[PDB]
Amino acid sequence: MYDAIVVGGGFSGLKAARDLTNAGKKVLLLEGGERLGGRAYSRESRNVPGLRVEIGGAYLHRKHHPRLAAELDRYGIPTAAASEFTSFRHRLGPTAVDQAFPIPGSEAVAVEAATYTLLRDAHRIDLEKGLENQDLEDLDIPLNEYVDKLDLPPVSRQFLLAWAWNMLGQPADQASALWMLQLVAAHHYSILGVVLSLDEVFSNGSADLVDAMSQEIPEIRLQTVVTGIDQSGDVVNVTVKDGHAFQAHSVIVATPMNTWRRIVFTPALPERRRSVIEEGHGGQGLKILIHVRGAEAGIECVGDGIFPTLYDYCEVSESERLLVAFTDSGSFDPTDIGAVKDAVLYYLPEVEVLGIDYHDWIADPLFEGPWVAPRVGQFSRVHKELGEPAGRIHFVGSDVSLEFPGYIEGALETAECAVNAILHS
Amino acid sequence: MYDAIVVGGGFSGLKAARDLTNAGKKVLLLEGGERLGGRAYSRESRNVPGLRVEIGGAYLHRKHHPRLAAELDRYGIPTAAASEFTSFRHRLGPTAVDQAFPIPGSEAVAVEAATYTLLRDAHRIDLEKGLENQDLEDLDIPLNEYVDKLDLPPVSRQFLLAWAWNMLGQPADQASALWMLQLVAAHHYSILGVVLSLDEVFSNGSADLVDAMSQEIPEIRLQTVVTGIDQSGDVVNVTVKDGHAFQAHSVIVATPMNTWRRIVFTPALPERRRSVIEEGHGGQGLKILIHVRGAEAGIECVGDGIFPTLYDYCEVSESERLLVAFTDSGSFDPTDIGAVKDAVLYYLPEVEVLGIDYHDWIADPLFEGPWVAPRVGQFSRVHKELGEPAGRIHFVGSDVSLEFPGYIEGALETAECAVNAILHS
Ligand SMILES: Cc1cc2nc3c(=O)[nH]c(=O)nc-3n(C[C@H](O)[C@H](O)[C@H](O)COP(=O)(O)OP(=O)(O)OC[C@H]3O[C@@H](n4cnc5c(N)ncnc54)[C@H](O)[C@@H]3O)c2cc1C
Ligand SMILES: Cc1cc2nc3c(=O)[nH]c(=O)nc-3n(C[C@H](O)[C@H](O)[C@H](O)COP(=O)(O)OP(=O)(O)OC[C@H]3O[C@@H](n4cnc5c(N)ncnc54)[C@H](O)[C@@H]3O)c2cc1C
Ligand SMILES: NCCc1ccc(O)c(O)c1
Ligand SMILES: NCCc1ccc(O)c(O)c1
């Protein structure tokens, strides 16, 4: 019997389990997989033997992510500034300029006006109240309709759409405008900031921080899949797939939102949460690492291709590199290499694709999705509650962070909040 | 005896007198000077014999100025697109980029945030209510204080300040923030638009339109200075400096705001207007035409110099040009050529000043100022009323336009409005 059982060994669970430990509590961390880190997954490249790649969460920005920064400072984890872009190869039409900010002057007045509308709209969201408690329904519509209302000329329109596709992991017709404004809000009410937060990387991968953190957790069970969390008795009983149950005064669910439906909760969770939990969020982010020949360093491409963005990731040799493409799994099949060639050649006709590397987050039973993105209409029905305690069971993780959802920083923030709650209750 | 006496032969009076005429009214136009056009003043250059220069109002933009556009269309007056800028020589510090929009990326987030604040603030102004009827007092503070609140990094801060100086004709400490926001509002709620409205010029000078218009006015008295307007009787009596009085059912005052205090009105004007009329507005715009050698075509300079802006105006020969500088008459003495050399050399150290040409609008008794700019605190006390009828006497002109003050378009709009009022009353 434990003071707390933490279910899930991504950053959320790891921080929770460690902080509770250091506070003097008796803590058990249960991880379903064979590794720690969750959606922060560094490993050897499938294409380049010996090369260590981030297959999920990679980037941070110290100004926007103070908790993460403090983790890095705590353990002396080195960070390098992310791959700089010297070469611009956009597909935004003939009037675009080949630089990082490709808007031409002919569009400046329009961009000015949209910047006001977007920020006005984002200034409606208060980041503590929850997206369902602020009469924001009018905004919770498909992104494409919202962007059609803005009436943007071609370059800025497509530029906005491409990054929106990248960041949200959803085509414009499935993405919620409200959620886009939520990301704008989370970045100190900045549209620009949403892209400028790709500022830094882990010099040796996320696993450095994963290991530094796990060092301080005395009890961890890998390969342990929780299937039931039962709080009907005086002490919470946690049921596991293959073996003896575990019990604790408190349980922290630190698993991905889309996996919650695979656990039996007793009693059943508060009913307002149930339909969203059953359908899952709509995130379909697809990140592909593309092994290439013939690409010069520092390329960045944004445009109207099936890869909204494609840019430099890593140097492999003097002739070979890794590029990264973002798109979504409903729109693109990464196992279709011809398709990948076409998507790449569209921006970079001189570039030869050697191979691809990715992780199928959706098909992974321990995840059932990459980062969170709500379906249209979801989060104006229920959002804040999803991360609220139901009795003695707490819910944490990037997925339910109000402050920085979809980012490592969000995983850390929700954890902090659960820890403090437990240290009083 | 006339249906109407129009006092002043700038664009305002000219349109009024013509439209009233064409409506079948019996109209007399009284002009104090020896020319028509007022602050739209084309003439021979003082520096370059044979060269025709705009010494006042020169630029327009068809999208922002529909009335002016229709005048030009009516008379087939040719317009050329204004001098294009190929060369940028800013004094905005070492991080500025030498292009028309000199903001660097390091400042983009800050500019984004200020753009929201500025436009939010400008969106408070409704362009029909008058700046004194909307609880805008909080904004009617010195521009420098308002801009200090925005907390802008060096390039965008100085860039904003320099154009504000240019457009308002006042140093930051004397200019009202409210008035700046008013200009933003007038340009379809665009900061950018305030500078992009320098779009076109009269191919042969403003006098073309002045003449086309005056052709259609059958009675005009030049060298006729009105000194009194007396409406105590049944018919308005207009007193003139040297000679017999004139009378009419209606009088349109179409003279510059700052000259109104030199006329005796009977009865005295409504008392709320009196103190502003006595002090005059604070406009001190100084436009200097600088004859130069050693300047290549297409130069534009913006910066922190005593000339906030200095840019290409006219080609004189293969070695000689005219540049134009804007500043204000309280800050700079244009008769001091050494000073002019220093101001120019500051941006363009290779450029030799041959001579200068300007008009002293403030010292001209028929004007007592260039374009309107209120003193801090003036227009939130009284603004809309200044252009409102006092009995049978109407007040028109750029100075009192709510829609486009300081522009020819404003002169046209106020006139239209007086004409319609008279055609009913
Ligand atoms: C492609 C991609 C790119 C990203 N890039 C960035 C980025 O650049 N910057 C950034 O900040 N973030 C990025 N992220 C987001 C970030 O990686 C995650 O949002 C964050 O790591 C979430 O961590 P977590 O602790 O909330 O949950 P997770 O990391 O998902 O951890 C959940 C853990 O629970 C375990 N689990 C699941 N089911 C059970 C079960 N029933 N029983 C026991 N254990 C179970 C899982 O194995 C997993 O270890 C990216 C994400 C993806 C998918
Ligand atoms: C330096 C400068 C640059 C400018 N640049 C531009 C520009 O680029 N674009 C733009 O749109 N506008 C510009 N303007 C503004 C524009 O020129 C004026 O605001 C506009 O022409 C005002 O015209 P008006 O009809 O209101 O009055 P005015 O043009 O001033 O006409 C008033 C008339 O009344 C006469 N008068 C004065 N007192 C008496 C009296 N007591 N009795 C009889 N008659 C009298 C004067 O002689 C004058 O003819 C500029 C102005 C200046 C000063
Ligand atoms: N909700 C944003 C999650 C995210 C994080 C990193 C990325 O590179 C990305 O495209 C999207
Ligand atoms: N109130 C703006 C009046 C104005 C008009 C033309 C100019 O060139 C200028 O600097 C200012």
Curated annotation (Swiss-Prot), chains A, B:
SUPFAM superfamilies the record matches: FAD/NAD(P)-binding domain (SSF51905)
Name the record gives this protein: (S)-6-hydroxynicotine oxidase
Family: Belongs to the flavin monoamine oxidase family.
Pathway given in the UniProt record: Alkaloid degradation; nicotine degradation; 6-hydroxypseudooxynicotine from nicotine (S-isomer route): step 2/2
EC number: 1.5.3.5
Record note on what altering Y311F does: 4-fold decrease in kcat/Km and kred for (S)-6-hydroxynicotine, with larger effects on the kcat/Km value for (S)-6-hydroxynornicotine
Free-text comment on the cofactor: Binds 1 FAD per subunit.
InterPro entries (alphabetical): Amino_oxidase, FAD/NAD-bd_sf, Flavin_amine_oxidase, Flavin_MAO
This protein's domain notes: Consists of two domains, an FAD-binding domain and a substrate-binding domain. The inactive D-stereoisomer binds in mirror symmetry with respect to the catalytic axis, revealing absolute stereospecificity of hydrogen transfer to the flavin.
Keywords: Alkaloid metabolism, Cytoplasm, FAD, Flavoprotein, Nucleotide-binding, Oxidoreductase, Plasmid
GO-annotated biological processes: alkaloid metabolic process; nicotine catabolic process
Induction record: Induced in the presence of L-nicotine and D-nicotine. Expressed during logarithmic growth and stationary phase.
Principal location class: cytoplasm
A Pfam entry, by short name: Amino_oxidase
Gene: 6-hlno
Cofactor: FAD
Swiss-Prot/TrEMBL catalytic activity: (S)-6-hydroxynicotine + O2 + H2O = 6-hydroxypseudooxynicotine + H2O2; (S)-6-hydroxynicotine + O2 = 6-hydroxy-N-methylmyosmine + H2O2
Residues that bind (S)-6-hydroxynicotine: N166, Y311, F326, W371, Y407
Function: Involved in the degradation of L-nicotine. Catalyzes the oxidation of (S)-6-hydroxynicotine (6-hydroxy-L-nicotine) to 6-hydroxypseudooxynicotine. Oxidation of the pyrrolidine ring of (S)-6-hydroxynicotine leads to the formation of the optically inactive 6-hydroxy-N-methylmyosmine, which hydrolyzes spontaneously to 6-hydroxypseudooxynicotine. Acts with absolute stereospecificity on the L-form of 6-hydroxynicotine. Can also use (S)-6-hydroxynornicotine.
Subcellular compartments: Cytoplasm
Residues involved in FAD binding: S12, E31, G38, R39, G56, G57, A58, Y59, V226, S398, G406, Y407, I408
